[PDB]
């Protein structure tokens, strides 16, 4: 868990590593903290895994139902009002902290909701195990108005500061760029700094090493 | 006491060139007392396989819950459910019980009758999904497996070599786990033909 | 852990497993659960890995001073007393150890003394301490006879530890055997429980509910 | 056991081609209260070492005393007391670590995190941590409190490995360490705005800078933030 | 015997100055130490003074070094 | 805990179940029957928490019997134990769960095979050649691992079971006041009132 | 409440070869979810051709070792610079450890070297003194991920001679220091993949009848 | 707890003491002698905490014996029990107290009268016609209140004591593995190895 | 569990014209189990009487401690200690153990061989003294006694009437106390002649 | 427990009720909280009974030993320095709060020491269960300089306010007046407001009511 988000001139960008923990052992070596609420509305989820991926799921589905019925593109504060209204109802027993970002026919937006339903806004946000790492890489190299490439370069250079200095985060970087009057771009692996070197021996066994007791061919249909 | 370690057990899945393998031990015991060595953790609905670990009473219930569910599916859509369409299910399913979870660690694995591509997936008790192109492990000897799989695994093994690699991982972790063993069984799943095998292992 | 010892015409028979475990993982399958106090006495190892190993090795030094002074073999009773006494001094402090001190002197014949950190000191003929003690006791209770041959006395101890090994998750590995005589103890090897099972099932018929 | 009352926060530091740096504001918190400022956490020792202390102040004040007396003592019957045979960083630190441990081992610790920076008499750089548990470790960069979470990261984008110290200009080292001190003050309710940075160059010697502050900040972009999602005015 | 005791007290003093501070005990210091110990035995009742002289040598941060100690506590550097 | 043993042989199942009943310091009875026949060829022993124990047993018995007159057909051992595991399964996640462990041993007149199912209060079911609940296993399981054979006669099983009890007596701290044995087969249930009358 | 203990991650490993012995151990040093140094050795030569490493709570480790080394020093002082037989060493370490039976050193220590016949030799220790002559022992944070592997490889477990069914166990031959280090390296990389407390670097000390050799290899800085 | 009975009759004292020894789940022995003769005509049974139990017994025995050769005279039941209560009395207020309960039954060759003293770990001593420690009293005390008479023969006492045991068996949850009896009188101590050989 | 109520028991003292009376029950039991009915709580050193309640093992020890002490006194001063000179003692005595007290409630009572005046006194575990011209009570049925004494007491009773009043108080409180009974004994102390009597009471 | 003290022109006076509690039951119906430290130095003790009567005891005895040796009348601050020095040593485990009062060849004094060793001074003090009662009767009717009879009248009219309104105090009042150049006067019962009315029946039984089982005449001497 190590996510960030930063908006520029015509849109906003968020990035997240891809490493699920579970104690000190690694579970997923290539996860995906970036979810889609609606075409141009995306979330970054830190904390309790199942919860964030299940909550975005929900809200998304409902907003899809909303726009259809109202015949207008999904605003971003809706997706926000929904999430934090739900998060609250459960006094924080649904540990999903996240960064919601997107663009509606009224500009570009960026928010950060905590577990209990509290929400805040700024131009750049960090949530996760290495939030303090990627927040020294943001309180240093930040300036108002940043090219698309600059914003992208900064966000992905924050995540990286998380990967290396934090144990609760690593592997690759994932990015999603939302630009006004334009479609959204999903960059599954805008980077791949970690790639296990090759082994020192081939560990394939010669056929017949393992001892068998019974064998047979099971059926399937009817 | 952790509810997910009273009964014990392990499950592991792997992918190869046009096939998958799913394997598990056989022991079911209460704490230290070994009770059975014929307790299988791998079931199947059509051409979709599911292995389950954790609290035995839940493992059983889930199988029944999914058999039940898949039979109703087939009947209604006039076709058997697919591996992905199924994963999504057992995930939602596990979650509808987010505040009184079943204490398990499922693992789906099959071949898609349309595309023809291999599939393996894992979940934790509340239903968080997890695809991987190489392997899935779950259980008491969970770590011993990650250690074996992160060594012996090799992309695109031939079904005959996959059987050897997967077996060896299972076999050896179960030996460093005090609550897993008493036999094992491994499956090698192809588009067609499915071969099942029981292995010989220490009985201690 | 499954350790045991017993008396009979041939003297004493000691048998143990070798599994050591941390939580639910097998940190080791190569433990020497038999402390060779000295050429004539053996102590087993239950309870605490170190407490058993440490004090019993200490005890050996004690016997040596005693023998040099009296110019005579120390008796199993006096040795077992020394141990339990030192143990009793630390009652409360948190030691931990169930143990069988086994010897066979000229005057007292073959003697087993169970001793633990509580301060208990029991004389006996059959003892089993461990997490598999209950299973070992089974095979043992039903088959023991004072007139057991030596060959069979060893096989009994072996089959006993095996029974535990199979059922008790915290027991297993390889059985280690010793036979204690009026001239000292004799090691009778280390047999891997893995291999021994298949052997017994096959040559004894027992262990039917196991497919293999 | 015990509990710390008055407390100094972080103490960041790093190495370069000719020497090492070490900073640490001057605030001595009393819980949520900031009851102090004329607090100095950089205790130089001799003419080649400096010790940045964090944690309980009463215990820091205690060590300092110990250090002074360690000095006034090395002289006792030793004419080279300022040349050949005069306290090195490694002597000081070895001695300190000893005490620290000896203490936890008596269940009566000194609630502190410590950094001993300096340059050996033969010119080598010396940077080593040591907290109330006795745990110690070396590294290019070091920091207490948040330093470990917020400083470190930055001071690593500079010297990522043991093969960069040689190419780190005494000037670049500092310009970072201070931007770091900007960050520390940006996000850490227990920190002060003005500090004390001390350098230990093998050529120039010891430079003990005092009372400075963090300039070059960005709060303008605040006017733009309004409410938390709905408020438009 | 006396020498044993002395040389031994010395081995100790060096070890302390090594573990604690991690600095090799300077030779001059070893003199003071052997003098102050020999000292005590010339000022109290009941005992006797060490009957043994020693020539100490070493190499600290001041290069070579030689000393000559006598049972009266007089260590001179030659 | 109480004693609950059971073993399947050539063509029948045998159930052993201690007779004592203890409330704290005293023993209010030394002739209690922990059994309860669900149908002509299905028998079920139990042991667990004081009140929960027989309230549950009778409940199960009532359902089976109801089903049997309704269908006029007899439910099979396999399906009977399945129903039980279902209930207990739901039980574990309810305001207050029954704390009852059981053994079901019936004769499947359809396959002409005896079957024995062992189920614990959590809903954990397993088919075995022989079983036991609670601490009862540690003292016996090894003896049975040793001598049991599937070809055994009813006559041989008893002899075996006798050994297990003798062991339970020699090494168990509690005095269970003996056991009561019962046999299930093609002809139904009968009580070996001669392991007691011995 | 003051708690005197801490876990600084780490993993060490010791294999005993036919006539040499090794003892490796990564260099990363941690505290909770952070990094304290990517290179801080935990494997030292103690003299008389004996390598030792104490892993667990950093400080107790340094203490034991220092305490052991000062002990080798005096063994010489009192018995005419006689060499310390590695067996004699373990017995000694026991007393050191058991010395604090009621305020235990929170560490798993391991020594390794050569016996009095020239054969390799390893020794694993309880955190209170229980020692056994092991021939291959992983101790530390990820020991549970390397032991199953060596079991299989160094000791050929669960491997049988093809075409003989479960009847002939594959025979064990003994590995050349070369092969052992290839084994050791693969084990540590795997471990870094799946365990967040392992990474950064791997330092290895080889004991042979010529002295002690040291080799290093960089690991991923996840 | 263990069983400790004792009863004084016409001219002697009788002591009953269960034989089993149990460590947790198993029974390491069913032939333990909780007795320990302090002198030719003083006998003392005990029951309590695992280690404390016999370390104490032997200690007491050592003191009495020492006194006896020294004085060459034999200490009296009354004075012997007094000494014991003294020690245990000091024990209760010490870093760690012995948790041992006891029964002392000797023959006072000076008055030609048998005497039985019952003492608990707290230092509480009392002279009684019959006694017991722990839970042992609730099952017996009424039977003895009923039949006991001071004129009873040694021969009659045993018969009585037999009844108490039979009751202990019928209503006590623990299986104490029988008792071992011993008689103290003008001729010393002897063991009724026929309550066991019966 | 209160250490001063495991064993149980009661003691009461009264003053009359040239005499005193001291009485107590006889029971000693553990919790509910009644163990003895011959356990006396009243002792005497010379012409001084002391009754003690509370933890039996301490009651016994104290008697021995005071016997011991008084014998040494007599020998040294060549005269028996007096009631007041004694009270002061058992008070200091109890106190020297202020941080690990004996769990008792003593009650002194005698006649002064010089003055000839009656005396009765009470103390609590740490030794606080307490004289009274009428009565002292202590024990488990402590309250039942204050209720009886604060009714049946009468200044200057004749020894023959005192015996009747004191007996009745004891007798009736012990009946409303579950841990006191099984018999009683009462003493009537004059300058000379001391009469001791055992009473008949319910044995439940 | 309800004590007070007040000084006037030529001395000081303290008063205390006489009722020891012990739960809700009354123990002593006529106690004596007033102790003598030395002829003209007296204490009033509230709280844990045995403690105050045993501590005054001590200090008294020592001061007697002090004056004798120094050949001068006992100062009052000595008795104070002693008490609070002792009280402190025992971190309040000797619950004795009290009011020390007296007169030495340097004037009249009045102090109040709490359990932990804390001491305070004023012209009038109250300590006990009914301190708030008798402290409303002091913060109302108090004036500087009060006749001896006034001081006495006030102090005894404070105690009375304690007796009636408090349950942890009652029965009679006890007073002690210390005057300069004069001996001290101890007034055991300067008041007796409570005196049980006479009963309604004579409860004497007819001789022979009680049933006896045995009788005999026990001995005493030798």
UniProtKB/Swiss-Prot annotation, chains A, J:
Additional notes on this entry: The side chain of Thr-1 acts as a nucleophile, and the N-terminal amino group acts as a proton acceptor. Present with 11400 molecules/cell in log phase SD medium.
GO function term, MF aspect, one: threonine-type endopeptidase activity
Highest taxon in the source lineage: Eukaryota
Principal cellular location given in the protein's record: cytoplasm
CDD domains: proteasome_beta_type_7
The protein's Enzyme Commission number: 3.4.25.1
Subunit-structure text: The 26S proteasome consists of a 20S proteasome core and two 19S regulatory subunits. The 20S proteasome core is composed of 28 subunits that are arranged in four stacked rings, resulting in a barrel-shaped structure. The two end rings are each formed by seven alpha subunits, and the two central rings are each formed by seven beta subunits. The catalytic chamber with the active sites is on the inside of the barrel.
Subcellular localization(s) per the UniProt record: Cytoplasm; Nucleus
PANTHER family in UniProt: METALLOPROTEASE TLDD (PTHR32194), PROTEASOME SUBUNIT BETA TYPE-7 (PTHR32194:SF4)
Enzyme class (EC, first level): hydrolase
Name of this protein: Proteasome subunit beta type-2
Active site: 1
Entry similarity comment: Belongs to the peptidase T1B family.
Catalytic activity entry: Cleavage of peptide bonds with very broad specificity
GO biological process, one term: proteasome-mediated ubiquitin-dependent protein catabolic process
SUPFAM superfamilies: N-terminal nucleophile aminohydrolases (Ntn hydrolases)
Keywords in alphabetical order: Cytoplasm, Hydrolase, Nucleus, Protease, Proteasome, Threonine protease, Zymogen
Record GO cellular component, one term: proteasome core complex, beta-subunit complex
UniProtKB/Swiss-Prot annotation, chain C:
Keyword Hydrolase belongs to the record: yes
Keywords in alphabetical order: Cytoplasm, Hydrolase, Nucleus, Protease, Proteasome, Threonine protease, Zymogen
Superkingdom to which the source organism belongs: Eukaryota
Catalytic activity: Cleavage of peptide bonds with very broad specificity
Molecular function via GO: endopeptidase activity; threonine-type endopeptidase activity
EC number: 3.4.25.1
Keyword Zinc annotated: no
Note: The side chain of Thr-1 acts as a nucleophile, and the N-terminal amino group acts as a proton acceptor.
Its biological purpose: The proteasome degrades poly-ubiquitinated proteins in the cytoplasm and in the nucleus. It is essential for the regulated turnover of proteins and for the removal of misfolded proteins. The proteasome is a multicatalytic proteinase complex that is characterized by its ability to cleave peptides with Arg, Phe, Tyr, Leu, and Glu adjacent to the leaving group at neutral or slightly basic pH. It has an ATP-dependent proteolytic activity. This unit is responsible of the chymotrypsin-like activity of the proteasome and is one of the principal target of the proteasome inhibitor bortezomib.
Family per record: Belongs to the peptidase T1B family.
Protein name (database record): Proteasome subunit beta type-5
UniProtKB/Swiss-Prot annotation, chain E:
Subcellular compartments: Cytoplasm; Nucleus
Designated name of the protein: Proteasome subunit alpha type-6
Native source species: Saccharomyces cerevisiae (strain ATCC 204508 / S288c)
Gene for this chain: PRE5
More info: Present with 7210 molecules/cell in log phase SD medium.
Family, similarity comment: Belongs to the peptidase T1A family.
Subunit and interaction comment: The 26S proteasome consists of a 20S proteasome core and two 19S regulatory subunits. The 20S proteasome core is composed of 28 subunits that are arranged in four stacked rings, resulting in a barrel-shaped structure. The two end rings are each formed by seven alpha subunits, and the two central rings are each formed by seven beta subunits. The catalytic chamber with the active sites is on the inside of the barrel.
Function: The proteasome degrades poly-ubiquitinated proteins in the cytoplasm and in the nucleus. It is essential for the regulated turnover of proteins and for the removal of misfolded proteins. The proteasome is a multicatalytic proteinase complex that is characterized by its ability to cleave peptides with Arg, Phe, Tyr, Leu, and Glu adjacent to the leaving group at neutral or slightly basic pH. It has an ATP-dependent proteolytic activity.
Curated annotation (Swiss-Prot), chains F, H:
GO biological-process terms attached to the record: proteasomal ubiquitin-independent protein catabolic process; proteasome-mediated ubiquitin-dependent protein catabolic process
Keyword annotations of the record: Acetylation, Cytoplasm, Nucleus, Phosphoprotein, Proteasome
PROSITE patterns membership: PROTEASOME_BETA_1, PROTEASOME_BETA_2
Pfam family, one: Proteasome
Subcellular location: Cytoplasm; Nucleus
GO cellular component term, pick one: endoplasmic reticulum membrane
Main location: cytoplasm
Sites bearing N-acetylmethionine, chain numbering: 1
Quaternary data: The 26S proteasome consists of a 20S proteasome core and two 19S regulatory subunits. The 20S proteasome core is composed of 28 subunits that are arranged in four stacked rings, resulting in a barrel-shaped structure. The two end rings are each formed by seven alpha subunits, and the two central rings are each formed by seven beta subunits. The catalytic chamber with the active sites is on the inside of the barrel.
Name used for this protein in its record: Proteasome subunit beta type-4
Organism (species): Saccharomyces cerevisiae (strain ATCC 204508 / S288c)
Organismal lineage: Eukaryota, Fungi, Dikarya, Ascomycota, Saccharomycotina
């Amino acid at each position: 868990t190590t996510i960030v988000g930063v908006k520029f001139n015509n849109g906003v960008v968020i990035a997240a590593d891809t490493r699920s923990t579970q104690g000190p052992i690694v579970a997923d070596k290539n996860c995906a903290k970036l979810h889609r609420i609606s075409p141009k509305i995306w979330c970054a989820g830190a904390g309790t895994a199942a919860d964030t991926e299940a909550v975005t799921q929900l809200i998304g589905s409902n907003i899809e139902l909303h726009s259809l019925y109202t015949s207008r593109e999904p605003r971003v504060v809706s997706a926000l009002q929904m999430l934090k209204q739900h998060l609250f109802k459960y006094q924080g027993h649904i540990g999903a902290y996240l960064i919601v970002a997107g663009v509606d026919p009224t500009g570009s937006h960026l928010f950060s909701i905590h577990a209990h339903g509290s929400t805040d806004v700024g131009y750049y946000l960090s949530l996760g195990s290495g939030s303090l790492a990627a927040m020294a890489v943001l309180e240093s190299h930040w300036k108002q108005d940043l090219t698309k490439e600059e914003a992208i370069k900064l966000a992905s250079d924050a995540i990286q500061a998380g990967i290396w200095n934090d144990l609760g985060s690593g592997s690759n970087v994932d990015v999603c760029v939302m630009e006004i009057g334009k479609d959204a771009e999903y960059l599954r692996n805008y980077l791949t700094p970690n790639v296990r070197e090759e082994k020192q021996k081939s560990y394939k066994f010669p056929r017949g090493t393992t001892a068998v007791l019974k064998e047979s061919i099971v059926n399937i249909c009817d | 006491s952790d509810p997910s370690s009273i009964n014990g057990g392990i499950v592991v899945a792997m992918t190869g060139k046009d096939c998958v393998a799913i394997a598990c031990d056989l022991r079911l015991g209460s704490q230290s007392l070994g009770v059975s060595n014929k307790f299988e953790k791998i079931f199947h609905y059509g051409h979709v396989f599911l292995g389950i670990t954790g609290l035995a009473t839940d493992v059983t219930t889930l199988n029944e819950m999914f058999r039940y569910k898949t039979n109703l599916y087939k009947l209604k859509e006039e076709r058997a459910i697919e591996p992905e369409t199924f994963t999504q299910l057992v995930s939602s399913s596990l979650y509808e019980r987010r505040f009184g979870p079943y204490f398990v660690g499922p693992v789906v694995a099959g071949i898609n009758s349309k595309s023809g591509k291999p599939f393996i997936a894992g979940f934790d008790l509340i239903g968080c999904i997890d695809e991987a192109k190489d392997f899935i492990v779950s259980g008491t000897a969970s770590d011993q497996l990650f250690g074996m799989c992160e060594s012996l695994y090799e992309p695109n093994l031939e079904p005959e070599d996959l059987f050897e690699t997967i077996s060896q991982a299972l076999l050896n972790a179960a030996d460093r786990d005090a609550l897993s063993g008493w036999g094992a069984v491994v499956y090698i799943i192809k588009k067609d033909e499915v071969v099942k095998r029981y292995l010989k292992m220490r009985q201690d | 852990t499954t350790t045991l010892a017993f008396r009979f015409q041939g003297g004493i028979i000691v048998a143990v497993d070798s599994r050591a475990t941390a939580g639910n993982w097998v940190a080791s399958q190569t433990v020497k659960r038999v402390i060779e106090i000295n050429p004539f006495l053996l102590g087993t190892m239950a309870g605490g890995a170190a407490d058993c190993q440490f004090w019993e090795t200490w005890l050996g030094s004690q016997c040596r001073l005693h023998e040099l002074r009296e110019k005579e073999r120390i008796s199993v009773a006096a040795a077992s007393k020394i141990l339990s006494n030192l143990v009793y001094q630390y009652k409360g402090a948190g030691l931990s150890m169930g143990t069988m001190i086994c010897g066979y002197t000229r005057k007292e014949g073959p003697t087993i003394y169970y001793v633990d950190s509580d301060g208990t000191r029991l004389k006996g003929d059959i003892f089993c301490v461990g997490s598999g003690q209950t299973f070992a006791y089974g095979v043992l209770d039903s088959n023991y006879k004072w007139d057991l041959s030596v060959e069979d006395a060893l096989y009994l101890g072996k089959r006993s530890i095996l029974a535990a090994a199979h059922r008790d998750a915290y027991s297993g590995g390889s059985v280690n055997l010793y036979h204690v005589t009026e001239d000292g103890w004799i090691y009778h090897g280390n047999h891997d429980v893995g291999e021994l099972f298949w052997k017994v099932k096959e040559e004894e018929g027992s262990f039917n509910n196991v497919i293999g | 056991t015990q509990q710390p009352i008055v407390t100094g926060t972080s103490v960041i530091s790093m190495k370069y081609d000719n020497g090492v740096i070490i900073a640490a504001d001057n605030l001595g918190s009393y819980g949520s209260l900031l009851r102090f400022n004329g607090v100095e956490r950089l205790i130089p020792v001799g003419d080649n070492t400096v010790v940045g202390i964090s944690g309980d102040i009463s215990d820091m004040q205690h060590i300092e005393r110990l250090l002074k007396d360690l000095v006034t003592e090395n002289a006792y019957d030793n004419p080279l007391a300022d040349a050949e045979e005069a306290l090195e960083p490694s002597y000081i630190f070895e001695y300190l670590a000893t005490v620290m441990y000896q203490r936890r081992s008596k269940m009566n610790p000194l609630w502190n995190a410590i950094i001993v920076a300096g340059v050996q008499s033969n010119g080598d750089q010396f940077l080593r941590y040591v907290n109330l548990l006795g745990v110690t470790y070396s590294s290019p960069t070091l920091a207490t409190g948040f330093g470990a979470h917020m400083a470190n990261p930055l001071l690593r984008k500079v010297v990522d490995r043991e093969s960069d110290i040689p190419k780190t200009t005494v000037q670049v080292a500092e310009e970072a360490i201070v931007n770091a001190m900007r960050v520390l003050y940006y996000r850490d309710a227990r920190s002060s705005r003005n500090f004390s940075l001390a350098i230990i160059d093998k050529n120039t010697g010891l430079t003990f800078k005092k009372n400075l502050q963090v300039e070059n900040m960005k709060w303008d972009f605040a006017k733009d933030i309004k409410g938390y999602g709905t408020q438009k005015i | 015997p006396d020498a044993r005791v002395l040389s031994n007290y010395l081995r100790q003093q060096c070890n302390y100055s090594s573990l604690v501070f991690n600095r090799k005990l300077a030779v001059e210091r070893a003199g003071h130490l052997l003098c102050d110990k020999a000292q005590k035995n010339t000022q109290s009742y009941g005992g006797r003074p060490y009957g043994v002289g020693l020539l100490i040598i070493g190499y600290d941060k001041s290069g070579a070094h030689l000393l000559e100690f006598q049972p009266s506590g007089n260590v001179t550097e030659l | 805990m109480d004693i609950i043993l059971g073993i399947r042989v050539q063509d029948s199942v045998i159930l052993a179940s201690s007779k004592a009943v203890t409330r704290g310091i005293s023993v209010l009875k030394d002739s209690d029957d922990k059994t309860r026949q669900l149908s002509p060829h299905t028998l079920m022993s139990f042991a667990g928490e004081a009140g929960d124990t027989v309230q549950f047993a009778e409940y199960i018995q009532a359902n089976i019997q109801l089903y049997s007159i309704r269908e006029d057909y007899e439910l099979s051992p396999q399906a009977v134990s399945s129903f039980v595991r279902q209930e207990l399964a739901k039980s574990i996640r309810s305001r207050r769960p029954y704390q009852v462990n059981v053994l079901i041993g019936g004769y499947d007149k359809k396959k002409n095979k005896p079957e024995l199912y062992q189920i614990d209060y959590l809903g954990t079911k397993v088919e075995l050649p022989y079983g036991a609940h609670g601490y009862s296993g540690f003292y016996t399981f090894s003896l049975l691992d040793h001598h049991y054979r599937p070809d055994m006669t009813t006559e041989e099983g008893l002899d075996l079971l006798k050994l297990c009890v003798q062991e339970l007596e020699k090494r168990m701290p509690m005095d269970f006041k003996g056991v009561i044995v019962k046999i299930v087969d093609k002809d139904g249930i009968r009580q070996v009132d001669d392991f007691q009358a011995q | 409440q003051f708690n005197p203990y801490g876990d600084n991650g780490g993993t060490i490993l010791g294999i005993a070869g036919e006539d040499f012995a090794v003892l490796a151990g990564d260099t990363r040093n941690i505290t909770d979810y952070s990094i304290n140094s990517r290179y801080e050795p935990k494997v030292f030569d103690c003299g008389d051709n004996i390598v030792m490493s104490a892993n667990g709570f950093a400080a107790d480790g340094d203490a034991l070792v220092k305490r052991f080394k000062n002990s080798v020093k005096w063994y010489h002082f009192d018995h005419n610079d006689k060499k310390l037989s590695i067996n004699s060493a373990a017995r000694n370490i026991q007393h050191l450890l058991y010395g604090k039976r009621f305020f235990p050193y929170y560490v798993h220590t391991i020594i390794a070297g050569l016996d009095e016949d020239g054969k390799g030799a390893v020794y694993s220790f309880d955190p209170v003194g229980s020692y056994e002559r092991e021939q291959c022992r992983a101790g530390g944070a990820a020991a549970s991920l390397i032991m199953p592997f060596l079991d299989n490889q160094v000791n050929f477990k669960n491997q049988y001679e093809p075409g003989t069914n479960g009847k002939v166990k594959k025979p064990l031959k003994y590995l050349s220091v070369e092969e052992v280090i290839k084994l050791v390296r693969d084990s540590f990389t795997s471990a870094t993949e799946r365990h967040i407390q392992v990474g950064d670097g791997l330092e290895i000390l080889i004991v042979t009848k010529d002295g002690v050799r040291k080799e290093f290899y960089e690991l991923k800085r996840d």
